[PDB]
Amino acid sequence: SHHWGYGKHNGPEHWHKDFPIAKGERQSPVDIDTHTAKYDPSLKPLSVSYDQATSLRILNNGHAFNVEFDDSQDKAVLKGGPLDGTYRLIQFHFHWGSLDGQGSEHTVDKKKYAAELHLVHWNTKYGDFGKAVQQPDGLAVLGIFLKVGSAKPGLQKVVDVLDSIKTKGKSADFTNFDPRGLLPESLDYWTYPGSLTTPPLLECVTWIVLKEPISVSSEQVLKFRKLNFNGEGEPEELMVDNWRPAQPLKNRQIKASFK
């Protein structure tokens, strides 16, 4: 079959066997070379409208945990920046490390952060998520780096329920979560065309990666690292290092929103 993971034999280096697009022209993540990434003055202001965001549930899918949202109307939408039209938030999740010095998928001048938050939106041009993922302009993912320092109050509600979804397949109701509480103070960003960073690795993503990291506490990070890849009863495999390394940039240019 096409089971995949982050281990020695089922991890990113081997994904291509089952998902040949893994060696495609627009794979993610990438290293962001700040020297070559040029200001684009044509990028419009980035707009997030999250006041009416409706979170539904949190689940451990054996690779990460996802917080899922009602995307049936324009209640949590990303617009502007590089984007044409309206993108609805469907879910967010994180990637993180076993150690603070690794965990991010994107890197900045080769620097790795402790983790990376992905807020996943899809383009209402296409009428549902399934249709959007099949298109180069189908998704917009807002990438937010985490470093370890001061606790992040707006993360605490997430961290506080991770004990209920320790293992693969677990889910719980998760309402009234405000994703605005996960944002940094500056929304300066880089953007480039790329892919899902997990199988099926489709090249449907406009990446928007914020320059300014959020700070989270070592306590919050420790809670992430206590999660399991495995299901209940199976041998323990700590959910850590669920990040894909930098892929070749190939022909692509990375644009900066800031002068």
Residues with catalytic annotation? 63
Q: Is the separation of the CB atoms in 115 and 151 below 8 Å? A: no
Smaller CB distance to Zn ion: residue 140 or 235? 140
| Span interacting with Zn ion, options 16-24, 33-41, 70-78, 112-120, rule CB under 5 A | 112-120
> Alpha-carbon distance 84 to 132, whole Å?
14
Q: Is residue 121 near Zn ion by the rule CB under 5 A?
A: no
Amino acid sitting at position 226: K
Q: Is 106 annotated as a binding residue?
A: no
Closest-approach residue to Zn ion (CB): 118
Smaller CB distance to Zn ion: residue 88 or 118? 118
> Alpha-carbon distance 59 to 239, whole Å?
13
> Alpha-carbon distance 194 to 243, whole Å?
16
Q: Is 2 annotated as a binding residue?
A: no
Site string for Zn ion, 159-198 (x = CB under 5 A): ----------------------------------------
Minimum distance from residue 35 beta carbon to Zn ion (Å) = 26
Q: Is 197 annotated as a binding residue?
A: yes
Minimum distance from residue 118 beta carbon to Zn ion (Å) = 3
Give kind and range of the element (H or E) at residue 49: strand 44-49
Q: Is 167 annotated as a binding residue?
A: no
Kindly list the distances between the CA atom of residue 65 and the CA atoms of 34, 106, 227, in Å, as whole numbers in the listed order: 31, 19, 9
Smaller CB distance to Zn ion: residue 123 or 242? 242
| Span interacting with Zn ion, options 38-46, 49-57, 113-121, 173-181, rule CB under 5 A | 113-121
Site string for Zn ion, 22-61 (x = CB under 5 A): ----------------------------------------
- Number of residues in contact with Zn ion, rule: CB under 5 A? 1
Which residue, chain included where needed, has tokens 């960073």? Answer: 197
Minimum distance from residue 198 beta carbon to Zn ion (Å) = 7
Q: In degrees, to the nearest 5, what angle opens at C-alpha 13 toward C-alphas 8 and 14?
A: 80
Q: In degrees, to the nearest 5, what angle opens at C-alpha 157 toward C-alphas 92 and 106?
A: 35
Q: Is residue 106 near Zn ion by the rule CB under 5 A?
A: no
Q: Torsion angle of alpha carbons 187, 116, 81, 192, nearest 10°? A: 130
- Strands 115-123, 171-173: pairing is unpaired
Q: Is 198 annotated as a binding residue?
A: yes
Q: Is the separation of the CB atoms in 86 and 74 below 8 Å? A: yes
- Strands 205-210, 139-148: pairing is parallel
Q: Is residue 118 near Zn ion by the rule CB under 5 A?
A: yes
Cβ neighbour number for residue 11 with a 10 Å cutoff: 15
Minimum distance from residue 235 beta carbon to Zn ion (Å) = 25
Smaller CB distance to Zn ion: residue 31 or 127? 31
Smaller CB distance to Zn ion: residue 174 or 243? 243
Residues that bind Zn ion (CB under 5 A): 118
Binding residues for substrate: 197-198
